[PDB]
Motif scaffolding. Structure first.
Motif, mmCIF file in Angstrom:
data_model
loop_
_atom_site.group_PDB
_atom_site.id
_atom_site.type_symbol
_atom_site.label_atom_id
_atom_site.label_comp_id
_atom_site.label_asym_id
_atom_site.label_seq_id
_atom_site.Cartn_x
_atom_site.Cartn_y
_atom_site.Cartn_z
ATOM 1 N N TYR A 1 -4.764 -9.321 5.431
ATOM 2 C CA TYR A 1 -3.899 -8.172 5.103
ATOM 3 C C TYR A 1 -4.182 -6.965 6.003
ATOM 4 N N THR A 2 -4.147 -7.187 7.311
ATOM 5 C CA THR A 2 -4.226 -6.109 8.298
ATOM 6 C C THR A 2 -3.040 -6.197 9.237
ATOM 7 N N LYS A 3 -2.848 -5.141 10.021
ATOM 8 C CA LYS A 3 -1.672 -5.030 10.873
ATOM 9 C C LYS A 3 -1.565 -6.267 11.752
ATOM 10 N N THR A 4 -2.707 -6.750 12.228
ATOM 11 C CA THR A 4 -2.725 -7.880 13.150
ATOM 12 C C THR A 4 -2.954 -9.227 12.448
ATOM 13 N N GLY A 5 -3.219 -9.202 11.137
ATOM 14 C CA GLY A 5 -3.426 -10.421 10.364
ATOM 15 C C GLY A 5 -2.089 -11.040 9.986
ATOM 16 N N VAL A 6 -2.099 -12.278 9.498
ATOM 17 C CA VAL A 6 -0.847 -13.011 9.286
ATOM 18 C C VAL A 6 0.025 -12.437 8.176
ATOM 19 N N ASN A 7 -0.595 -11.748 7.218
ATOM 20 C CA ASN A 7 0.131 -11.140 6.097
ATOM 21 C C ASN A 7 0.645 -9.712 6.391
ATOM 22 N N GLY A 8 0.226 -9.140 7.516
ATOM 23 C CA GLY A 8 0.509 -7.741 7.804
ATOM 24 C C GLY A 8 -0.363 -6.824 6.943
ATOM 25 N N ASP A 9 -0.337 -5.520 7.193
ATOM 26 C CA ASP A 9 -1.163 -4.598 6.420
ATOM 27 C C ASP A 9 -0.833 -4.677 4.925
ATOM 28 N N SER A 10 -1.872 -4.589 4.088
ATOM 29 C CA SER A 10 -1.696 -4.511 2.643
ATOM 30 C C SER A 10 -0.657 -3.450 2.242
ATOM 31 N N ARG A 11 -0.602 -2.321 2.939
ATOM 32 C CA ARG A 11 0.305 -1.268 2.489
ATOM 33 C C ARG A 11 1.757 -1.682 2.571
ATOM 34 N N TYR A 12 2.044 -2.659 3.424
ATOM 35 C CA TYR A 12 3.441 -3.023 3.662
ATOM 36 C C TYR A 12 4.060 -3.554 2.374
ATOM 37 N N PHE A 13 3.289 -4.337 1.628
ATOM 38 C CA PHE A 13 3.865 -5.019 0.477
ATOM 39 C C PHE A 13 3.857 -4.070 -0.727
ATOM 40 N N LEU A 14 3.136 -2.950 -0.612
ATOM 41 C CA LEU A 14 3.145 -1.936 -1.675
ATOM 42 C C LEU A 14 4.463 -1.166 -1.751
ATOM 43 N N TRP A 15 5.212 -1.145 -0.655
ATOM 44 C CA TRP A 15 6.393 -0.280 -0.562
ATOM 45 C C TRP A 15 7.410 -0.438 -1.713
ATOM 46 N N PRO A 16 7.834 -1.665 -2.027
ATOM 47 C CA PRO A 16 8.845 -1.746 -3.097
ATOM 48 C C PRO A 16 8.343 -1.204 -4.434
ATOM 49 N N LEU A 17 7.046 -1.338 -4.687
ATOM 50 C CA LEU A 17 6.462 -0.973 -5.978
ATOM 51 C C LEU A 17 6.150 0.523 -6.030
ATOM 52 N N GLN A 18 5.424 1.002 -5.028
ATOM 53 C CA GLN A 18 5.040 2.404 -4.994
ATOM 54 C C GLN A 18 6.256 3.286 -4.710
ATOM 55 N N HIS A 19 7.069 2.933 -3.716
ATOM 56 C CA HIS A 19 8.153 3.816 -3.321
ATOM 57 C C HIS A 19 9.442 3.485 -4.070
ATOM 58 N N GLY A 20 9.860 2.223 -4.009
ATOM 59 C CA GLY A 20 11.171 1.845 -4.484
ATOM 60 C C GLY A 20 11.243 1.941 -5.990
ATOM 61 N N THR A 21 10.085 1.839 -6.651
ATOM 62 C CA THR A 21 10.046 1.868 -8.110
ATOM 63 C C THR A 21 9.363 3.119 -8.672
ATOM 64 N N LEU A 22 8.073 3.285 -8.435
ATOM 65 C CA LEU A 22 7.330 4.365 -9.095
ATOM 66 C C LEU A 22 7.730 5.765 -8.552
ATOM 67 N N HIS A 23 7.702 5.954 -7.247
ATOM 68 C CA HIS A 23 8.153 7.229 -6.686
ATOM 69 C C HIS A 23 9.613 7.515 -7.082
ATOM 70 N N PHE A 24 10.470 6.494 -7.080
ATOM 71 C CA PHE A 24 11.881 6.693 -7.407
ATOM 72 C C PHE A 24 12.041 7.316 -8.782
ATOM 73 N N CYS A 25 11.146 6.936 -9.681
ATOM 74 C CA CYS A 25 11.174 7.408 -11.056
ATOM 75 C C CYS A 25 10.378 8.698 -11.250
ATOM 76 N N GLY A 26 9.826 9.204 -10.163
ATOM 77 C CA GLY A 26 9.168 10.486 -10.198
ATOM 78 C C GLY A 26 7.669 10.475 -10.338
ATOM 79 N N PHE A 27 7.046 9.305 -10.466
ATOM 80 C CA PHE A 27 5.585 9.244 -10.491
ATOM 81 C C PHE A 27 4.990 9.790 -9.213
ATOM 82 N N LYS A 28 3.833 10.412 -9.329
ATOM 83 C CA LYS A 28 2.980 10.561 -8.167
ATOM 84 C C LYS A 28 2.066 9.346 -8.174
#
Ligand SMILES: Cc1cc2nc3c(=O)[nH]c(=O)nc-3n(C[C@H](O)[C@H](O)[C@H](O)COP(=O)(O)OP(=O)(O)OC[C@H]3O[C@@H](n4cnc5c(N)ncnc54)[C@H](O)[C@@H]3O)c2cc1C
Ligand SMILES: Cc1cc2nc3c(=O)[nH]c(=O)nc-3n(C[C@H](O)[C@H](O)[C@H](O)COP(=O)(O)OP(=O)(O)OC[C@H]3O[C@@H](n4cnc5c(N)ncnc54)[C@H](O)[C@@H]3O)c2cc1C
Ligand SMILES: CC[n+]1c(-c2ccccc2)c2cc(N)ccc2c2ccc(N)cc21
Ligand SMILES: CC[n+]1c(-c2ccccc2)c2cc(N)ccc2c2ccc(N)cc21
Ligand SMILES: CC[n+]1c(-c2ccccc2)c2cc(N)ccc2c2ccc(N)cc21
Ligand SMILES: [Zn+2]
Ligand SMILES: [Zn+2]
Lengths: 230, 230
Positions: free
Chosen positions: B155-182
Motif C-alpha cells: 500500500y505505497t505509491k510504488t506498491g501494487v495496491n497504490g498508496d493506502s490513502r487512495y482507497f480512503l477517498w470514497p469513505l473519507q471524502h465522498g461519504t464522511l466529509h460530504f456529510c460534514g464530518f471532520k
C-alpha cells in the motif's frame, strides 16, 4: 461470435434510468446473438452480509471465525451456500461482466458490494498466487456502468467531488483487476435526475451505440497513472 | 470535556483482531470517562439493503420508486424504518464516530456499506444545499480504523495496491466529509494475519496508546491533495 454476458444489476425500480440501461444492454446484446444472463440483485433479495451461513456443514476453525479463510476452504471443499455458487457459475461461464448500478457514496450500493464480497472468494476469483494480472478470472472482461447524482463538472480534478477516476480505483483496481479481469472503460451516465428528457435519451443512446462495438474494445491500463496521473 | 463516542463495528467474530481493536477502544474511552456506544452490525443482523421497506408511510411517487427521494421525504415525515432512526440517534448524540472494520475490496464490508447507505439519508446527514463543509453532521469527528490483508509496503505509491490513502477517498471524502464530518487521521493496522503474535500485540497497543490523546488531535484536510499528492 459466441460470447456470454452476465449483467449484475442493482436497482430497485424497473422503470428507473438504471433499469433502462440494463434493458438496452439485454436487448442489444441479445440482438447481436450473445448469450445473456441478468442477476437482478434486489429482485433476488440477494444476501449482502458475509456470515458463517455462507459455509454449509463443518467449519475449518470453529473456534475463531475468519470469513475469508472459511470461504476459501469451503470453495475448495464444495461447501459454499448455493446463492454464492449460483453466481460463481454465471461468472465462470461469462466472457464479459457488466455491472449496472447507481453510485452510492462514491461506490456500489451495499447489495452489490455484498455480491462482490461473497462471490469473489479466494480460490474462485484469486489466490496465492494469482491476482492482479494473474487473477483467476483472467481472460474475462468487466465493465462498470454507473449513474450519478453529481454532474460531470463536479467530477473533475479541481471540482468538489474530484475526478470520477478517483472513485473508480477501489472497484476497477482493488476488486476487478485484482481478480484478473481486464477492465473496459467505464460507462458513466452523469446526473440523469437533473438532466432533461433529451439529455437522458442521449445518454441511453450513447450506451446502446457503445454496445454495438463492445467486442472491438481495448481494455484500459488499470494503473495508478490512469486513475490519478496527468 | 464530556465526550460521547459511537463505534460502528463490522466483524463477525468477537475474538478477531478487529474485535480486539474494538474492545481496547471501549476499554480506553470508558477509562477516560467518555460515554461509549457500539453498533455491532453483524450481531444486530443489520439490514444492508436499500429497499422500499425502509419507508413505512405514503410514498411520494408510488409508481416509480426512487430510494433517495423517498427516504428524504420519509425522514422529514418521520416514517423511516426504526432501525434507521435508531442509528441516527446514536450519530446525532456522538461527538466522535469510529468505524472499526476489515478492508473488503478496498472498502468497507457490505453490512457497513449498508449502514452508510441507509443511515446517512438526505435531511439527516446533508441537504441540497448543505454538504461537504456545510454538511449537517458538521461539528462531529469521524475516524476509520481499518485492518488489511495486504502489507504496508503493498500500500505505497510504488506498491501494487497504490498508496493506502487512495482507497480512503470514497469513505473519507465522498461519504464522511460530504456529510460534514471532520476526519481524524485513519488508523490502519496492516496485515495482522501475516504478522507475528508480538507484532499483533504491538498494533493493538498502538491504537490504545493513540486513543489516550485522541481528543487533542486535529482533523486532516480532507482534500484531493491529502489523498493523492501533487
Ligand atoms: C444512499 C445514496 C447515496 C448516494 N451517493 C451518491 C454519491 O456519492 N455521488 C453521486 O454523484 N450520487 C450519489 N447518489 C445519487 C444516485 O447516484 C442517483 O440518485 C442515481 O444515480 C440516479 O439513478 P437512477 O437510475 O435511480 O435515476 P432515476 O430517478 O430512475 O432516473 C432519472 C429519470 O430518468 C427517467 N428515465 C428512465 N428511463 C429513461 C429513458 N429510457 N429515457 C429517458 N428518461 C428515462 C426516469 O423516469 C427518472 O425520472 C446517492 C443516492 C443514494 C440513494
Ligand atoms: C471478501 C474479502 C475481501 C477482502 N479484500 C481485501 C482487500 O481489498 N485488500 C486487503 O488488503 N485485504 C482484503 N481482505 C483481507 C482482510 O482485510 C483481512 O482478512 C482482515 O483485515 C483481517 O482482519 P481480522 O480481524 O479478520 O483478522 P484475524 O484473523 O481475526 O486476526 C489475525 C490474528 O490475530 C489474532 N488476534 C486477535 N486478537 C489479538 C490480540 N489482541 N493480540 C494479538 N493477536 C490477536 C487472531 O486470533 C488471529 O489469529 C479481504 C478479505 C475478504 C474476506
Ligand atoms: C482472508 C484471505 N483473503 C485475503 C488475504 C488475507 C491475508 C493474506 C492473504 C490473502 C485477501 C487479500 C486481498 N488483498 C484481497 C482479497 C482477499 C480475500 C478475498 C476473499 C476471501 N474469501 C479471502 C481473502
Ligand atoms: C437522490 C437524493 N440523493 C442525492 C442526490 C441525487 C441527485 C441530485 C441531488 C442529490 C445524493 C447525491 C450525492 N452526491 C450524495 C448522496 C446523495 C443522497 C444520499 C442519500 C439519499 N437518501 C439521497 C441522496
Ligand atoms: C506479498 C505480501 N504477502 C502476502 C500477501 C498478502 C495479501 C495479498 C497477497 C499476498 C502473504 C500472504 C500470505 N497468505 C502469507 C504470506 C504473505 C507474505 C509473506 C511475506 C511477505 N514479505 C509478503 C507477503
Ligand atoms: Zn488496476
Ligand atoms: Zn474531503
Amino acid at each position: 461470435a459466441g460470447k456470454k454476458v452476465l449483467i449484475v444489476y442493482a436497482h430497485q425500480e424497473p422503470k428507473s434510468f438504471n433499469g433502462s440501461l440494463k434493458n438496452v444492454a439485454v436487448d442489444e446484446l441479445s440482438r447481436q446473438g450473445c448469450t445473456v444472463t441478468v442477476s437482478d440483485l434486489y429482485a433476488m433479495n440477494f444476501e449482502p452480509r458475509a456470515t458463517d451461513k455462507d459455509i454449509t456443514g463443518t467449519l475449518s476453525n470453529p473456534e475463531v471465525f475468519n470469513y475469508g479463510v472459511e470461504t476459501h476452504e469451503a470453495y475448495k471443499q464444495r461447501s459454499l451456500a448455493s446463492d454464492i455458487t449460483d453466481e460463481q457459475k454465471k461468472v465462470r461461464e461469462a466472457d464479459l461482466v457488466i455491472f449496472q448500478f447507481p453510485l452510492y457514496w462514491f461506490s456500489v450500493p451495499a447489495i452489490l458490494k455484498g455480491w462482490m464480497d461473497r462471490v469473489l472468494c479466494q480460490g474462485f476469483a484469486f489466490d496465492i498466487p494469482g491476482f492482479y494480472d494473474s487473477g483467476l478470472l483472467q481472460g474475462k472482461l468487466a465493465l462498470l456502468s454507473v449513474t450519478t447524482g453529481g454532474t460531470a463538472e463536479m467530477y473533475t480534478k479541481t471540482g468538489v467531488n474530484g475526478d470520477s477516476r478517483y472513485f473508480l480505483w477501489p472497484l476497477q483496481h482493488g476488486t476487478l483487476h485484482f481478480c484478473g479481469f481486464k477492465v473496459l472503460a467505464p460507462q458513466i451516465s452523469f446526473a440523469p435526475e437533473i438532466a432533461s428528457e433529451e439529455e437522458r435519451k442521449g445518454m441511453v443512446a450513447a450506451w446502446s451505440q457503445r454496445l454495438q462495438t463492445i467486442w472491438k474494445e481495448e481494455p484500459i491500463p488499470c494503473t495508478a497513472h490512469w486513475h490519478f496521473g496527468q
